[PDB]
From Swiss-Prot:
Consequence of substituting residue 43 to V: In a gastric adenocarcinoma sample; somatic mutation
Consequence when changing residue 317 to R: Loss of kinase activity
Organism: Homo sapiens (Human)
Residues the record marks as active site: 160
Cofactor requirement: Mg(2+)
N6-acetyllysine sites (modified residues): 45, 144
Protein name listed in UniProt: Mitogen-activated protein kinase 14
Taxonomy of the source species: Eukaryota, Metazoa, Chordata, Craniata, Vertebrata
């Protein structure tokens, strides 16, 4: 068991192994550090109240299980996980170590006007990461530029897959909607991609209803085919009672965009989820021909998420988390 040291950063106590030096607050809470073992910068996240409620204990476990599963180039994976605690009984704090990428896609759009080649490369990588996440039957659920780390070479990693602004949220989630599927992530990609092209937020809503109104201005009120699938009576007139609008021609909205980019946007930004392109299909779209390699777009091992159905006591979630900490095997 390594030697730990204690330090206080912004009135928070960090107790970490010595291998991690130069702790520096970036935002539980996150510290940048220097990993003397690999000679790289890392982010060390101390979880805040890991075991305070059943709901919290379960989400701490969820977070760890997810991070331990992710083994893909475009998905952030777990570099280390540790606790000061010897024994389960002293177990109270959880720290997660990941690659510090240095910028997010949000910081990047506000400076660089992005070229078409950059948008191909950036969206390609998001989709390649999503093909992997979705093959483990995981939904990101909150894909957005702040969840996208990008380095000097515009190489990209997806943060927080499966863990959860409303600007990138699919309409079905904005309206609650009993049960939705992985296609909500593709709506998000459409929103990101549009903004990487124009430099502007696609649907910068003020609140919830304003968001929905902007979405309908672009894509139009639902067609008869979508309305047939809507089982709830009230949702059905809450609809036929928002302002009647036609679908805009995206060729006319994203002027001066590559026509293949406009075509793929048309296939992502569809109200009806059943008709949205999938991550795998998109990777095969003519827009990424420079980047697509069918032999290098891997799928995930299966992810056992049965725990999601269970209602356990804080102590049990806590012991399950402790088992995961102990069983952790670091990457090559
Ligand atoms: C503005 C009105 C919102 C319409 C959004 C409905 C599109 C979501 O699409 C719907 O999603 C469900 C899964 O979530 C599917 O079971 C339905 O078949 C599909 O039409």
């Amino acid at each position: 068991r390594p030697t730990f040291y204690r330090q206080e950063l912004n009135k928070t106590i960090w107790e970490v192994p010595e291998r991690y030096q130069n702790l520096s607050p970036v935002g539980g809470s996150v510290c940048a550090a220097f990993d003397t073992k690999t000679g790289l910068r890392v982010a060390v996240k101390k979880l805040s109240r890991p075991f305070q409620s059943i709901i919290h204990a379960k989400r701490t476990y969820r977070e760890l299980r997810l991070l331990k599963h992710m083994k893909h180039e475009n998905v952030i994976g777990l570099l280390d996980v540790f606790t000061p605690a010897r024994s389960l009984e002293e177990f109270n704090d959880v720290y997660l170590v990941t690659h510090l990428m240095g910028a997010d896609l949000n910081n990047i759009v506000k400076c660089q006007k992005l070229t078409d080649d950059h948008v191909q490369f950036l969206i390609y990588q998001i989709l390649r990461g999503l093909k992997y996440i979705h093959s483990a039957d995981i939904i990101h659920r909150d894909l957005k530029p702040s969840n996208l780390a990008v380095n000097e070479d515009c190489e990209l990693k997806i943060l927080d897959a499966g863990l959860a602004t409303r600007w990138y949220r699919a309409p079905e989630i904005m309206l609650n909607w009993m049960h939705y599927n992985q296609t909500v992530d593709i709506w998000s990609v459409g929103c990101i991609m549009a903004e990487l092209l124009t430099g502007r937020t696609l649907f910068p809503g003020t609140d919830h209803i304003d968001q929905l109104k902007l979405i309908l201005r672009l894509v139009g009120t639902p067609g008869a085919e979508l309305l047939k699938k809507i089982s709830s009576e009230s949702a059905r007139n809450y609809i036929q009672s928002l302002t009647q609008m036609p679908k805009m021609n995206f060729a006319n909205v994203f002027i001066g965009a590559n026509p293949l980019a406009v075509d793929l946007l048309e296939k992502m930004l569809v109200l009806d989820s059943d008709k949205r392109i999938t991550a795998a299909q998109a990777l095969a779209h003519a827009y990424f021909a420079q980047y697509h390699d069918p032999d290098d777009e891997p799928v995930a091992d299966p992810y056992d998420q049965s725990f999601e159905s269970r209602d356990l006591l804080i102590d049990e979630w806590k012991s399950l988390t402790y088992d995961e900490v102990i069983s952790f095997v670091p990457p090559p």
